Amino acid sequence: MATWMAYTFGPSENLANVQGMKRVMEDIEKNTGGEVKFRLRLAGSLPIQATDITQAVGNGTVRFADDGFYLGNVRIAGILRLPMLLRSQEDFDKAYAIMKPYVERDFGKQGVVVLGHFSFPHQVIFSARKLESLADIKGQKLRVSSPEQAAFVQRAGGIPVTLGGAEVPSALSAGTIDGALTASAGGGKIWGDMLKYNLRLPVNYFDGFYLVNKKAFEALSPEMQAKMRESVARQAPGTTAQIAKEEGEVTDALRQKGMVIVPSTPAMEQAATDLVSGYWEDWAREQGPEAVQALAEVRKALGR
Template sequence: MTRLLTTSFAALLATTAIAQAEDWTGYTYSSVSTTAAVKGMTRIGERVAEETGGDLTITLHLGKTLQIASSDITQAVGDGIVDFAADFFFSGNVPIARVLNLPMLIENDEEWAKAYAALEPILVEAFADQGVVLLGGYRYPEQTIFTTFEVNGLADLEGHKIRVTSPEQGHFIEEFGGAPITLSGSEVPTSLERGVIEGVLTASAGGAKNWHEFLPYNYRFPVNYGNSMIIANVDAFEALSPETQETLRKIVAEEGPATTAAFLEDEEVQKKSQSEAGMTLVNAAEGDAAMAREKLAPYWEAWAEENGEDYVQALKVVRDAIGK
Protein backbone atom coordinates (compact mmCIF):
# COMPACT_ATOMS: atom_id res chain seq x y z
CA MET A 1 0.00 0.00 0.00
CA THR A 2 2.84 2.40 0.93
CA ARG A 3 4.58 1.71 -2.36
CA LEU A 4 1.33 2.31 -4.25
CA LEU A 5 0.78 5.64 -2.48
CA THR A 6 4.36 6.69 -3.17
CA THR A 7 3.96 5.85 -6.86
CA SER A 8 0.65 7.71 -7.02
CA PHE A 9 2.16 10.75 -5.31
CA ALA A 10 5.08 10.80 -7.74
CA ALA A 11 2.67 10.63 -10.65
CA LEU A 12 0.66 13.49 -9.18
CA LEU A 13 3.79 15.61 -8.84
CA ALA A 14 4.75 14.90 -12.45
CA THR A 15 1.27 15.82 -13.65
CA THR A 16 1.36 19.04 -11.64
CA ALA A 17 4.78 19.96 -13.08
CA ILE A 18 3.53 19.40 -16.60
CA ALA A 19 0.46 21.52 -15.93
CA GLN A 20 2.62 24.39 -14.68
CA ALA A 21 4.93 24.37 -17.69
CA GLU A 22 4.36 27.26 -20.10
CA ASP A 23 5.14 27.18 -23.81
CA TRP A 24 5.19 30.72 -25.16
CA THR A 25 4.98 31.86 -28.75
CA GLY A 26 7.76 34.35 -29.48
CA TYR A 27 8.13 36.69 -32.45
CA THR A 28 10.73 39.04 -33.89
CA TYR A 29 10.51 41.61 -36.68
CA SER A 30 13.80 40.33 -38.14
CA SER A 31 13.50 37.68 -40.83
CA VAL A 32 17.22 36.81 -40.97
CA SER A 33 18.36 34.22 -38.45
CA THR A 34 22.03 35.28 -38.58
CA THR A 35 21.50 38.83 -37.28
CA ALA A 36 22.61 39.78 -33.79
CA ALA A 37 18.95 40.57 -33.02
CA VAL A 38 17.71 37.06 -33.78
CA LYS A 39 20.72 35.39 -32.21
CA GLY A 40 20.04 37.32 -29.01
CA MET A 41 16.38 36.33 -28.94
CA THR A 42 17.35 32.72 -29.62
CA ARG A 43 19.78 32.76 -26.69
CA ILE A 44 17.02 34.08 -24.44
CA GLY A 45 14.77 31.16 -25.41
CA GLU A 46 17.52 28.60 -24.92
CA ARG A 47 18.55 29.98 -21.54
CA VAL A 48 14.98 30.31 -20.29
CA ALA A 49 14.26 26.65 -21.06
CA GLU A 50 17.47 25.54 -19.36
CA GLU A 51 17.40 27.82 -16.31
CA THR A 52 13.73 27.22 -15.52
CA GLY A 53 14.09 23.47 -15.96
CA GLY A 54 11.51 23.55 -18.75
CA ASP A 55 8.90 25.46 -16.73
CA LEU A 56 8.98 28.06 -19.51
CA THR A 57 9.84 27.46 -23.15
CA ILE A 58 9.70 30.01 -25.96
CA THR A 59 9.21 29.05 -29.59
CA LEU A 60 10.62 31.94 -31.62
CA HIS A 61 9.13 32.82 -35.02
CA LEU A 62 11.04 35.04 -37.43
CA GLY A 63 9.59 38.14 -39.06
CA LYS A 64 7.01 37.53 -41.79
CA THR A 65 6.45 33.90 -40.70
CA LEU A 66 3.30 34.94 -38.81
CA GLN A 67 0.52 37.20 -40.07
CA ILE A 68 1.70 40.14 -37.96
CA ALA A 69 2.79 43.42 -39.52
CA SER A 70 6.03 44.86 -38.15
CA SER A 71 4.14 47.91 -36.92
CA ASP A 72 1.65 45.74 -35.01
CA ILE A 73 3.98 43.62 -32.88
CA THR A 74 3.38 45.42 -29.58
CA GLN A 75 -0.38 45.28 -30.18
CA ALA A 76 -0.14 41.55 -31.02
CA VAL A 77 1.66 40.94 -27.72
CA GLY A 78 -0.87 43.01 -25.79
CA ASP A 79 -3.73 41.09 -27.44
CA GLY A 80 -2.12 37.74 -26.59
CA ILE A 81 -1.64 36.69 -30.22
CA VAL A 82 1.98 36.09 -29.25
CA ASP A 83 3.37 35.98 -25.72
CA PHE A 84 6.85 37.38 -26.20
CA ALA A 85 8.54 39.54 -28.81
CA ALA A 86 11.27 41.92 -29.88
CA ASP A 87 9.76 45.04 -31.43
CA PHE A 88 11.75 47.65 -33.38
CA PHE A 89 8.62 49.33 -34.75
CA PHE A 90 6.94 49.99 -31.40
CA SER A 91 6.64 53.75 -31.77
CA GLY A 92 3.18 53.64 -33.36
CA ASN A 93 1.81 51.93 -30.26
CA VAL A 94 4.04 53.64 -27.70
CA PRO A 95 4.93 56.96 -29.37
CA ILE A 96 6.36 58.54 -26.24
CA ALA A 97 9.33 56.18 -26.62
CA ARG A 98 10.32 58.09 -29.76
CA VAL A 99 11.93 60.72 -27.55
CA LEU A 100 14.96 58.41 -27.52
CA ASN A 101 15.14 58.57 -31.30
CA LEU A 102 14.98 62.34 -31.80
CA PRO A 103 17.79 63.35 -34.17
CA MET A 104 20.86 64.93 -32.56
CA LEU A 105 19.45 64.55 -29.04
CA ILE A 106 21.46 61.47 -28.05
CA GLU A 107 24.85 61.38 -29.76
CA ASN A 108 26.95 58.67 -28.11
CA ASP A 109 26.83 55.47 -26.06
CA GLU A 110 27.22 57.24 -22.72
CA GLU A 111 24.33 59.60 -23.43
CA TRP A 112 22.16 56.69 -24.57
CA ALA A 113 22.77 54.75 -21.34
CA LYS A 114 21.91 57.77 -19.17
CA ALA A 115 18.85 58.70 -21.22
CA TYR A 116 17.38 55.21 -21.28
CA ALA A 117 17.90 54.67 -17.55
CA ALA A 118 16.15 57.95 -16.78
CA LEU A 119 13.24 57.30 -19.15
CA GLU A 120 12.72 53.63 -18.29
CA PRO A 121 9.99 54.16 -15.62
CA ILE A 122 7.95 56.17 -18.14
CA LEU A 123 8.46 53.47 -20.78
CA VAL A 124 7.41 50.69 -18.40
CA GLU A 125 4.16 52.52 -17.66
CA ALA A 126 3.51 53.32 -21.34
CA PHE A 127 3.94 49.69 -22.40
CA ALA A 128 1.80 48.53 -19.47
CA ASP A 129 -1.01 50.66 -20.90
CA GLN A 130 -0.82 48.37 -23.97
CA GLY A 131 -1.15 45.20 -21.86
CA VAL A 132 2.55 44.55 -22.18
CA VAL A 133 5.43 44.02 -19.75
CA LEU A 134 8.63 45.80 -20.83
CA LEU A 135 11.45 43.43 -19.94
CA GLY A 136 14.38 45.17 -21.62
CA GLY A 137 15.81 45.76 -25.05
CA TYR A 138 18.83 46.38 -27.24
CA ARG A 139 20.14 49.14 -29.43
CA TYR A 140 21.47 49.33 -32.96
CA PRO A 141 24.62 51.29 -33.79
CA GLU A 142 24.26 54.94 -34.78
CA GLN A 143 22.20 55.62 -37.87
CA THR A 144 24.41 57.24 -40.50
CA ILE A 145 23.90 58.40 -44.09
CA PHE A 146 24.41 55.97 -47.00
CA THR A 147 23.95 57.34 -50.50
CA THR A 148 24.30 56.77 -54.23
CA PHE A 149 25.90 60.23 -54.56
CA GLU A 150 28.99 61.75 -53.00
CA VAL A 151 28.50 63.38 -49.59
CA ASN A 152 31.15 65.41 -47.81
CA GLY A 153 28.82 67.40 -45.57
CA LEU A 154 25.17 67.71 -44.62
CA ALA A 155 24.67 70.46 -47.21
CA ASP A 156 25.14 67.81 -49.90
CA LEU A 157 21.76 66.26 -48.97
CA GLU A 158 19.90 69.14 -50.58
CA GLY A 159 17.59 68.04 -53.37
CA HIS A 160 18.08 64.31 -52.75
CA LYS A 161 15.52 61.63 -51.82
CA ILE A 162 16.44 59.73 -48.67
CA ARG A 163 14.64 56.76 -47.15
CA VAL A 164 13.80 57.25 -43.47
CA THR A 165 12.14 55.02 -40.86
CA SER A 166 10.44 57.67 -38.71
CA PRO A 167 8.91 61.16 -38.94
CA GLU A 168 11.77 62.38 -36.75
CA GLN A 169 14.40 61.18 -39.21
CA GLY A 170 12.29 62.75 -41.95
CA HIS A 171 12.45 66.12 -40.22
CA PHE A 172 16.24 65.86 -40.09
CA ILE A 173 16.43 65.28 -43.85
CA GLU A 174 14.07 68.19 -44.50
CA GLU A 175 16.22 70.52 -42.39
CA PHE A 176 19.02 70.01 -44.89
CA GLY A 177 16.93 70.37 -48.02
CA GLY A 178 16.37 66.68 -48.74
CA ALA A 179 13.14 64.82 -49.41
CA PRO A 180 12.35 62.06 -46.88
CA ILE A 181 10.64 58.93 -48.21
CA THR A 182 9.22 56.08 -46.10
CA LEU A 183 9.59 52.57 -47.54
CA SER A 184 9.68 49.05 -46.13
CA GLY A 185 13.06 47.39 -46.03
CA SER A 186 12.08 44.96 -48.78
CA GLU A 187 11.44 47.90 -51.13
CA VAL A 188 14.82 49.54 -50.64
CA PRO A 189 17.03 47.66 -53.16
CA THR A 190 14.62 48.10 -56.09
CA SER A 191 13.96 51.72 -55.14
CA LEU A 192 17.70 52.45 -55.13
CA GLU A 193 18.12 50.79 -58.52
CA ARG A 194 15.27 52.80 -60.02
CA GLY A 195 16.24 56.10 -58.44
CA VAL A 196 13.07 56.31 -56.35
CA ILE A 197 15.44 56.98 -53.45
CA GLU A 198 19.08 58.05 -53.48
CA GLY A 199 20.08 57.11 -49.98
CA VAL A 200 19.07 55.66 -46.63
CA LEU A 201 19.61 56.31 -42.95
CA THR A 202 20.79 53.08 -41.38
CA ALA A 203 23.75 51.36 -39.71
CA SER A 204 26.60 49.48 -41.36
CA ALA A 205 25.51 46.44 -39.35
CA GLY A 206 21.85 47.18 -40.11
CA GLY A 207 20.32 47.82 -43.51
CA ALA A 208 23.69 48.55 -45.15
CA LYS A 209 24.68 44.97 -44.48
CA ASN A 210 22.15 43.92 -47.11
CA TRP A 211 22.08 47.00 -49.37
CA HIS A 212 25.76 48.03 -49.51
CA GLU A 213 26.16 47.09 -53.18
CA PHE A 214 23.69 49.85 -54.09
CA LEU A 215 25.27 52.46 -51.79
CA PRO A 216 28.80 53.53 -52.76
CA TYR A 217 29.01 56.38 -50.20
CA ASN A 218 28.70 56.52 -46.43
CA TYR A 219 28.81 59.83 -44.58
CA ARG A 220 29.62 58.82 -41.00
CA PHE A 221 27.33 61.37 -39.38
CA PRO A 222 25.36 60.04 -36.37
CA VAL A 223 21.78 61.19 -36.99
CA ASN A 224 20.11 59.18 -34.22
CA TYR A 225 19.82 55.73 -32.68
CA GLY A 226 17.28 52.98 -33.24
CA ASN A 227 16.36 50.43 -30.58
CA SER A 228 14.20 47.37 -30.02
CA MET A 229 12.06 46.57 -26.99
CA ILE A 230 11.78 43.05 -25.58
CA ILE A 231 8.25 42.59 -24.30
CA ALA A 232 5.80 40.02 -22.93
CA ASN A 233 2.02 39.79 -22.65
CA VAL A 234 1.08 40.89 -19.15
CA ASP A 235 -1.36 38.03 -18.49
CA ALA A 236 1.10 35.41 -19.71
CA PHE A 237 3.85 36.95 -17.61
CA GLU A 238 1.74 37.14 -14.46
CA ALA A 239 0.75 33.49 -14.91
CA LEU A 240 4.39 32.51 -14.40
CA SER A 241 5.69 31.68 -10.96
CA PRO A 242 7.62 34.50 -9.24
CA GLU A 243 10.80 32.47 -9.64
CA THR A 244 10.29 32.07 -13.40
CA GLN A 245 9.43 35.77 -13.77
CA GLU A 246 12.66 36.69 -12.01
CA THR A 247 14.67 34.28 -14.16
CA LEU A 248 13.20 35.68 -17.37
CA ARG A 249 13.88 39.27 -16.30
CA LYS A 250 17.48 38.38 -15.38
CA ILE A 251 18.14 36.66 -18.70
CA VAL A 252 16.70 39.54 -20.74
CA ALA A 253 18.69 42.03 -18.64
CA GLU A 254 21.86 40.15 -19.63
CA GLU A 255 21.09 39.27 -23.23
CA GLY A 256 19.77 42.71 -24.22
CA PRO A 257 23.12 44.44 -23.60
CA ALA A 258 24.92 41.43 -25.10
CA THR A 259 22.93 41.94 -28.31
CA THR A 260 23.81 45.63 -28.34
CA ALA A 261 27.49 44.74 -27.90
CA ALA A 262 27.27 42.22 -30.76
CA PHE A 263 25.80 44.89 -33.03
CA LEU A 264 28.55 47.36 -32.14
CA GLU A 265 31.21 44.75 -32.85
CA ASP A 266 29.57 43.85 -36.16
CA GLU A 267 29.39 47.56 -37.06
CA GLU A 268 33.18 47.73 -37.13
CA VAL A 269 33.43 44.49 -39.09
CA GLN A 270 30.90 45.70 -41.67
CA LYS A 271 32.52 49.13 -42.01
CA LYS A 272 35.83 47.47 -42.83
CA SER A 273 34.21 44.99 -45.20
CA GLN A 274 32.18 47.67 -46.99
CA SER A 275 35.23 49.90 -47.35
CA GLU A 276 37.30 47.06 -48.78
CA ALA A 277 34.47 46.34 -51.24
CA GLY A 278 34.74 49.88 -52.60
CA MET A 279 32.41 51.98 -50.45
CA THR A 280 33.74 55.47 -49.69
CA LEU A 281 33.46 56.24 -45.96
CA VAL A 282 33.71 59.92 -45.04
CA ASN A 283 33.99 61.13 -41.45
CA ALA A 284 31.64 63.89 -40.32
CA ALA A 285 32.87 67.30 -41.36
CA GLU A 286 34.05 69.66 -38.64
CA GLY A 287 31.19 71.86 -37.50
CA ASP A 288 28.39 69.72 -38.95
CA ALA A 289 27.43 68.24 -35.57
CA ALA A 290 27.23 71.61 -33.79
CA MET A 291 25.31 73.14 -36.68
CA ALA A 292 22.85 70.22 -36.83
CA ARG A 293 22.34 70.24 -33.07
CA GLU A 294 21.50 73.95 -33.17
CA LYS A 295 19.03 73.39 -36.02
CA LEU A 296 17.31 70.43 -34.38
CA ALA A 297 17.06 71.62 -30.75
CA PRO A 298 13.94 73.76 -31.40
CA TYR A 299 12.37 70.74 -33.09
CA TRP A 300 12.75 68.64 -29.92
CA GLU A 301 10.71 71.19 -28.00
CA ALA A 302 8.10 71.59 -30.74
CA TRP A 303 7.76 67.81 -31.06
CA ALA A 304 7.13 67.42 -27.32
CA GLU A 305 4.72 70.34 -27.04
CA GLU A 306 2.72 69.15 -30.03
CA ASN A 307 2.23 65.75 -28.41
CA GLY A 308 1.30 66.90 -24.92
CA GLU A 309 2.51 67.42 -21.39
CA ASP A 310 3.65 63.80 -20.92
CA TYR A 311 6.01 64.23 -23.85
CA VAL A 312 7.28 67.55 -22.53
CA GLN A 313 8.09 65.81 -19.25
CA ALA A 314 9.72 62.85 -21.00
CA LEU A 315 11.95 65.17 -23.03
CA LYS A 316 12.92 67.05 -19.87
CA VAL A 317 13.81 63.79 -18.13
CA VAL A 318 16.12 62.83 -20.99
CA ARG A 319 17.71 66.26 -21.37
CA ASP A 320 18.33 66.52 -17.63
CA ALA A 321 19.94 63.07 -17.66
CA ILE A 322 22.38 63.90 -20.45
CA GLY A 323 22.87 67.57 -19.55
CA LYS A 324 21.69 68.92 -22.89
Protein backbone atom coordinates in the same frame (compact mmCIF):
# COMPACT_ATOMS: atom_id res chain seq x y z
CA MET B 1 5.74 23.29 -16.66
CA ALA B 2 4.93 25.64 -19.62
CA THR B 3 5.88 26.19 -23.33
CA TRP B 4 5.36 29.75 -24.38
CA MET B 5 4.87 31.06 -27.90
CA ALA B 6 7.56 33.56 -28.87
CA TYR B 7 7.73 35.86 -31.89
CA THR B 8 10.32 38.20 -33.41
CA PHE B 9 10.28 40.99 -36.00
CA GLY B 10 13.29 39.24 -37.63
CA PRO B 11 12.28 37.14 -40.67
CA SER B 12 15.24 34.73 -40.73
CA GLU B 13 17.62 32.82 -38.50
CA ASN B 14 20.84 34.49 -39.75
CA LEU B 15 19.90 37.85 -38.25
CA ALA B 16 21.83 38.96 -35.16
CA ASN B 17 18.60 40.08 -33.45
CA VAL B 18 17.15 36.59 -33.93
CA GLN B 19 20.33 34.92 -32.66
CA GLY B 20 20.17 37.23 -29.69
CA MET B 21 16.54 36.35 -29.10
CA LYS B 22 17.55 32.67 -29.07
CA ARG B 23 20.26 33.38 -26.50
CA VAL B 24 17.75 35.22 -24.30
CA MET B 25 15.29 32.30 -24.51
CA GLU B 26 18.01 29.71 -23.86
CA ASP B 27 19.11 31.56 -20.74
CA ILE B 28 15.52 31.83 -19.49
CA GLU B 29 14.99 28.07 -20.03
CA LYS B 30 18.17 27.11 -18.16
CA ASN B 31 17.70 29.68 -15.39
CA THR B 32 14.10 28.60 -14.72
CA GLY B 33 15.18 24.89 -14.66
CA GLY B 34 12.95 24.30 -17.67
CA GLU B 35 9.80 25.78 -16.02
CA VAL B 36 9.53 28.29 -18.88
CA LYS B 37 10.34 26.97 -22.38
CA PHE B 38 9.82 28.68 -25.71
CA ARG B 39 8.76 27.98 -29.25
CA LEU B 40 10.02 30.75 -31.54
CA ARG B 41 8.26 31.85 -34.72
CA LEU B 42 9.92 34.24 -37.16
CA ALA B 43 8.37 37.36 -38.66
CA GLY B 44 5.68 36.40 -41.18
CA SER B 45 5.22 32.81 -39.96
CA LEU B 46 2.23 34.08 -37.96
CA PRO B 47 -0.38 36.53 -39.27
CA ILE B 48 1.06 39.38 -37.18
CA GLN B 49 2.29 42.55 -38.93
CA ALA B 50 5.50 44.01 -37.39
CA THR B 51 3.72 47.10 -36.05
CA ASP B 52 1.21 44.78 -34.26
CA ILE B 53 3.70 42.80 -32.07
CA THR B 54 2.96 44.84 -28.94
CA GLN B 55 -0.76 44.13 -29.34
CA ALA B 56 -0.09 40.37 -29.98
CA VAL B 57 2.01 40.19 -26.79
CA GLY B 58 -0.56 42.21 -24.86
CA ASN B 59 -3.46 39.89 -25.74
CA GLY B 60 -1.44 36.66 -25.33
CA THR B 61 -1.46 35.49 -28.94
CA VAL B 62 2.23 35.26 -28.20
CA ARG B 63 3.73 35.45 -24.73
CA PHE B 64 7.21 36.81 -25.45
CA ALA B 65 8.68 38.83 -28.30
CA ASP B 66 11.19 41.38 -29.43
CA ASP B 67 9.70 44.48 -31.02
CA GLY B 68 11.27 47.39 -32.82
CA PHE B 69 7.96 48.86 -34.05
CA TYR B 70 6.39 49.70 -30.68
CA LEU B 71 6.16 53.50 -31.21
CA GLY B 72 2.60 53.29 -32.55
CA ASN B 73 1.43 51.85 -29.22
CA VAL B 74 3.88 53.64 -26.90
CA ARG B 75 4.09 57.11 -28.40
CA ILE B 76 6.03 58.75 -25.56
CA ALA B 77 8.99 56.42 -26.23
CA GLY B 78 9.60 58.34 -29.50
CA ILE B 79 11.90 60.68 -27.52
CA LEU B 80 14.44 57.83 -27.67
CA ARG B 81 14.66 58.13 -31.48
CA LEU B 82 14.74 61.92 -31.92
CA PRO B 83 17.48 62.85 -34.42
CA MET B 84 20.89 63.66 -32.89
CA LEU B 85 19.65 63.26 -29.34
CA LEU B 86 21.38 60.01 -28.28
CA ARG B 87 25.06 59.39 -29.12
CA SER B 88 25.78 56.29 -27.06
CA GLN B 89 24.22 53.58 -25.00
CA GLU B 90 25.21 55.63 -21.91
CA ASP B 91 23.00 58.39 -23.36
CA PHE B 92 20.26 55.82 -23.88
CA ASP B 93 20.58 54.67 -20.26
CA LYS B 94 20.34 58.25 -18.98
CA ALA B 95 17.29 58.94 -21.14
CA TYR B 96 15.62 55.65 -20.32
CA ALA B 97 16.01 56.24 -16.54
CA ILE B 98 13.67 59.18 -17.17
CA MET B 99 11.41 57.52 -19.75
CA LYS B 100 11.03 54.14 -17.97
CA PRO B 101 8.01 54.97 -15.74
CA TYR B 102 6.02 56.39 -18.70
CA VAL B 103 7.03 53.52 -20.99
CA GLU B 104 6.32 50.77 -18.46
CA ARG B 105 3.00 52.43 -17.58
CA ASP B 106 1.84 52.58 -21.20
CA PHE B 107 2.98 49.07 -22.14
CA GLY B 108 1.31 47.88 -18.90
CA LYS B 109 -2.03 49.47 -19.79
CA GLN B 110 -1.82 47.40 -22.96
CA GLY B 111 -1.09 44.10 -21.22
CA VAL B 112 2.72 44.09 -21.68
CA VAL B 113 5.71 44.05 -19.27
CA VAL B 114 9.13 45.27 -20.46
CA LEU B 115 11.99 42.87 -19.63
CA GLY B 116 14.86 44.49 -21.55
CA HIS B 117 16.17 46.56 -24.41
CA PHE B 118 18.75 46.24 -27.16
CA SER B 119 19.92 48.57 -29.89
CA PHE B 120 21.00 48.52 -33.50
CA PRO B 121 23.75 50.97 -34.34
CA HIS B 122 22.98 54.46 -35.42
CA GLN B 123 21.28 55.04 -38.67
CA VAL B 124 23.83 56.99 -40.73
CA ILE B 125 23.76 58.53 -44.25
CA PHE B 126 24.72 56.80 -47.51
CA SER B 127 24.59 58.33 -50.97
CA ALA B 128 25.45 57.69 -54.59
CA ARG B 129 26.26 61.40 -54.76
CA LYS B 130 29.20 63.09 -53.10
CA LEU B 131 28.52 63.29 -49.38
CA GLU B 132 31.46 64.27 -47.20
CA SER B 133 29.93 66.97 -45.05
CA LEU B 134 26.65 68.39 -43.82
CA ALA B 135 26.79 71.03 -46.57
CA ASP B 136 26.73 68.18 -49.13
CA ILE B 137 23.26 67.05 -47.98
CA LYS B 138 21.67 70.15 -49.56
CA GLY B 139 19.38 69.19 -52.46
CA GLN B 140 19.93 65.45 -52.08
CA LYS B 141 16.94 63.15 -52.17
CA LEU B 142 17.42 60.78 -49.22
CA ARG B 143 15.26 57.86 -48.28
CA VAL B 144 14.06 58.02 -44.68
CA SER B 145 12.19 55.57 -42.44
CA SER B 146 10.26 57.97 -40.14
CA PRO B 147 8.89 61.53 -39.93
CA GLU B 148 11.62 62.28 -37.40
CA GLN B 149 14.33 61.34 -39.92
CA ALA B 150 12.45 63.34 -42.57
CA ALA B 151 12.57 66.38 -40.30
CA PHE B 152 16.33 66.06 -39.89
CA VAL B 153 16.96 65.69 -43.64
CA GLN B 154 14.66 68.64 -44.43
CA ARG B 155 16.45 70.76 -41.94
CA ALA B 156 19.72 69.91 -43.39
CA GLY B 157 18.44 71.16 -46.78
CA GLY B 158 17.79 67.71 -48.20
CA ILE B 159 14.62 66.26 -49.68
CA PRO B 160 13.34 63.36 -47.61
CA VAL B 161 11.72 60.49 -49.43
CA THR B 162 9.79 58.17 -47.21
CA LEU B 163 10.43 54.73 -48.71
CA GLY B 164 10.45 51.21 -47.42
CA GLY B 165 13.67 49.24 -47.87
CA ALA B 166 12.21 47.20 -50.78
CA GLU B 167 11.65 50.20 -53.10
CA VAL B 168 15.19 51.47 -52.65
CA PRO B 169 17.09 49.57 -55.41
CA SER B 170 14.87 50.63 -58.29
CA ALA B 171 14.65 54.16 -56.77
CA LEU B 172 18.48 54.37 -56.82
CA SER B 173 18.80 53.01 -60.37
CA ALA B 174 16.12 55.45 -61.61
CA GLY B 175 17.74 58.34 -59.73
CA THR B 176 14.55 59.29 -57.88
CA ILE B 177 16.61 59.08 -54.71
CA ASP B 178 20.29 59.76 -54.29
CA GLY B 179 20.74 57.86 -51.05
CA ALA B 180 19.33 56.63 -47.80
CA LEU B 181 19.54 56.72 -44.05
CA THR B 182 20.41 53.19 -42.99
CA ALA B 183 23.17 51.16 -41.26
CA SER B 184 26.10 49.40 -42.94
CA ALA B 185 24.79 46.01 -41.89
CA GLY B 186 21.30 47.04 -43.02
CA GLY B 187 20.95 48.71 -46.37
CA GLY B 188 24.62 49.56 -46.79
CA LYS B 189 25.60 46.05 -47.66
CA ILE B 190 22.73 45.10 -49.94
CA TRP B 191 22.65 48.51 -51.74
CA GLY B 192 26.45 48.93 -51.58
CA ASP B 193 27.09 48.75 -55.34
CA MET B 194 24.64 51.60 -55.85
CA LEU B 195 26.16 53.87 -53.07
CA LYS B 196 29.60 55.52 -52.87
CA TYR B 197 29.70 57.88 -49.87
CA ASN B 198 28.93 57.16 -46.22
CA LEU B 199 28.74 60.09 -43.79
CA ARG B 200 28.64 58.36 -40.40
CA LEU B 201 26.67 61.04 -38.67
CA PRO B 202 24.75 59.39 -35.70
CA VAL B 203 21.25 60.38 -36.69
CA ASN B 204 19.21 57.98 -34.49
CA TYR B 205 19.12 54.44 -33.21
CA PHE B 206 16.83 51.70 -34.35
CA ASP B 207 16.13 49.53 -31.34
CA GLY B 208 13.94 46.88 -29.78
CA PHE B 209 12.40 45.85 -26.49
CA TYR B 210 11.98 42.37 -25.06
CA LEU B 211 8.28 42.22 -24.18
CA VAL B 212 6.33 39.68 -22.19
CA ASN B 213 2.59 39.16 -21.73
CA LYS B 214 1.82 40.83 -18.39
CA LYS B 215 -0.81 38.34 -17.21
CA ALA B 216 1.39 35.30 -18.01
CA PHE B 217 4.42 36.92 -16.43
CA GLU B 218 2.57 38.01 -13.26
CA ALA B 219 1.18 34.48 -12.91
CA LEU B 220 4.75 33.15 -12.49
CA SER B 221 6.00 32.74 -8.96
CA PRO B 222 8.12 35.55 -7.57
CA GLU B 223 11.20 33.30 -7.97
CA MET B 224 10.48 32.54 -11.64
CA GLN B 225 9.75 36.22 -12.41
CA ALA B 226 13.17 37.13 -10.97
CA LYS B 227 14.95 34.37 -12.92
CA MET B 228 13.29 35.47 -16.19
CA ARG B 229 14.22 39.11 -15.53
CA GLU B 230 17.79 38.09 -14.71
CA SER B 231 18.15 36.13 -17.91
CA VAL B 232 16.88 38.91 -20.15
CA ALA B 233 19.08 41.52 -18.37
CA ARG B 234 22.14 39.28 -18.77
CA GLN B 235 21.61 38.48 -22.45
CA ALA B 236 20.16 41.76 -23.84
CA PRO B 237 23.53 43.57 -24.01
CA GLY B 238 24.87 40.65 -25.99
CA THR B 239 22.32 41.33 -28.71
CA THR B 240 23.47 44.94 -28.94
CA ALA B 241 27.10 43.73 -28.94
CA GLN B 242 26.69 41.24 -31.75
CA ILE B 243 24.87 43.75 -33.89
CA ALA B 244 27.60 46.32 -33.21
CA LYS B 245 30.39 43.90 -34.12
CA GLU B 246 28.66 43.11 -37.41
CA GLU B 247 28.22 46.84 -38.15
CA GLY B 248 31.96 47.33 -37.76
CA GLU B 249 32.76 44.31 -39.92
CA VAL B 250 30.44 45.38 -42.69
CA THR B 251 31.72 48.97 -42.63
CA ASP B 252 35.29 47.67 -42.98
CA ALA B 253 34.16 45.47 -45.88
CA LEU B 254 32.45 48.42 -47.56
CA ARG B 255 35.65 50.47 -47.20
CA GLN B 256 37.57 47.69 -49.01
CA LYS B 257 34.92 47.72 -51.74
CA GLY B 258 35.55 51.45 -52.19
CA MET B 259 32.86 53.17 -50.09
CA VAL B 260 34.17 56.59 -49.07
CA ILE B 261 33.73 56.46 -45.30
CA VAL B 262 33.54 59.93 -43.61
CA PRO B 263 33.49 59.69 -39.84
CA SER B 264 31.46 62.11 -37.79
CA THR B 265 33.30 64.74 -35.76
CA PRO B 266 32.34 66.78 -32.71
CA ALA B 267 31.95 69.90 -34.87
CA MET B 268 29.71 68.12 -37.31
CA GLU B 269 27.54 66.66 -34.54
CA GLN B 270 27.17 70.03 -32.88
CA ALA B 271 26.16 71.65 -36.17
CA ALA B 272 23.68 68.87 -36.87
CA THR B 273 22.21 69.10 -33.37
CA ASP B 274 21.74 72.84 -33.86
CA LEU B 275 19.67 72.12 -36.97
CA VAL B 276 17.18 69.90 -35.11
CA SER B 277 17.11 70.82 -31.44
CA GLY B 278 14.22 73.21 -32.17
CA TYR B 279 12.34 70.42 -33.91
CA TRP B 280 12.65 68.25 -30.80
CA GLU B 281 10.53 70.78 -28.93
CA ASP B 282 8.02 71.05 -31.78
CA TRP B 283 7.75 67.24 -31.86
CA ALA B 284 7.21 67.15 -28.12
CA ARG B 285 4.48 69.81 -28.26
CA GLU B 286 2.70 67.71 -30.94
CA GLN B 287 2.91 64.66 -28.64
CA GLY B 288 1.58 66.61 -25.65
CA PRO B 289 2.43 67.87 -22.15
CA GLU B 290 4.02 64.64 -20.89
CA ALA B 291 6.34 64.51 -23.87
CA VAL B 292 7.23 68.18 -23.30
CA GLN B 293 8.05 67.46 -19.62
CA ALA B 294 9.93 64.22 -20.30
CA LEU B 295 11.96 65.79 -23.10
CA ALA B 296 13.04 68.64 -20.69
CA GLU B 297 14.28 66.05 -18.20
CA VAL B 298 16.09 64.01 -20.85
CA ARG B 299 17.80 67.08 -22.28
CA LYS B 300 18.93 68.17 -18.80
CA ALA B 301 20.39 64.68 -18.21
CA LEU B 302 22.23 64.64 -21.56
CA GLY B 303 23.34 68.31 -21.54
CA ARG B 304 22.08 69.11 -25.07
